[PDB]
Design a protein around this ligand. Structure first.
Ligand code: ADE
Lengths: 189, 193
């Protein structure tokens, strides 16, 4: 809790197209649609590898030390559906405004806003622990033509073998009860 | 080195820094509890991974060492402290533009010296995120802008996590000379001593 989930109109019913400025940026930077939704683009992957213990009795797997991506939400596709990661993820706000909703394994729900107006409780830099489900949606905002741009750094570096989607609203019901699950259903597959 | 090469051109602020920072920035400094950094500017370590990693460090001949997997930082340049003075780092550092505008000046051990601008107006060669290879000396300075009241705020991620052994900062222009023509160095002097 803390933020109050109130999806703008384009969040509930996404728009067919994003404003042209966001289109430009999308094409110039060659961002692509992510599995979760929104646009992204891995811009860095450490040349350094590191061995890491991973449960299968565990097993050693090797990953890059770190990975960086640009992640962008837009009226075009404003939601980044509920997904979980093995490693902690660092998020750095760059432009616009958005909101995050985290579902902890014990079933606790947390939601907060991302933006540069810290006085009004807007975070511009946040970390979400591995194992914690997360989703985020675009918040309307001028200043960045209704867009939301952030940078993400994963350590060890991202690897889909470490990524897992919330299995629909079902598993949501299991985690937060039906009444809450229903509320956050728009953020899941 | 894909960043568009930029023209090193300070402003009144840079060469003749202000006495105190402008109210809005000063307020941010107080609220976020940012401290003036050794190399200049203000900062704060926001996140230091609880998870660790063993890394091999030289002392040829080397030896293992434990490091936090990563460190996060808020770095801000203001008209009263507009320069991030030249300094190296064993590891690569990821930089992410957040507010304001600025310019970076790098000096590779080959003597090679690139310089680019940080801003969101990429249609003009400005970059919003950049990685500086360990080993390279980096300096940065403030660029007048209105969006962020002449401030320049970025975030830096270091992995392995920052340790003082990983840090060093060239002194005076002498070392700057034996890295760049004593001439080209003269120009890049305000980012040194
Ligand atoms: N580098 C990356 N590649 C794919 N999905 C990601 N999610 C976060 N970072 C990612």
């Amino acid at each position: 809790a803390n933020a109050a989930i109130e999806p703008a109109s384009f969040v509930k019913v996404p728009m067919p197209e994003p404003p042209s400025s966001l289109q430009q940026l999308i094409n110039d930077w060659q961002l692509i649609k992510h599995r979760e939704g929104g646009y992204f683009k891995e811009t860095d992957r450490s040349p350094y590898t590191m061995e890491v213990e991973k449960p299968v009795n565990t097993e050693m797997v090797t990953r890059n030390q770190s990975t960086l991506i640009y992640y962008l939400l837009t009226p075009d596709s404003p939601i980044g559906k509920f997904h979980k990661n093995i490693n902690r993820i660092i998020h750095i706000l760059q432009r616009g405004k958005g909101q995050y909703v985290l579902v902890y394994p014990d079933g606790q729900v947390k939601s907060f806003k991302v933006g540069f107006d810290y006085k009004n409780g807007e975070v511009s830099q946040w970390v979400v622990p591995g194992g914690v489900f997360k989703a985020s949606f675009l918040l309307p905002n001028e200043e960045f033509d209704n867009g939301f741009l952030i940078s993400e750094v994963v350590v060890p570096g991202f690897d889909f073998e470490d990524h897992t989607f919330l299995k629909g609203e079902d598993e949501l019901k299991h985690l937060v009860g039906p009444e809450k699950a229903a509320e956050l259903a728009f953020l899941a597959h």
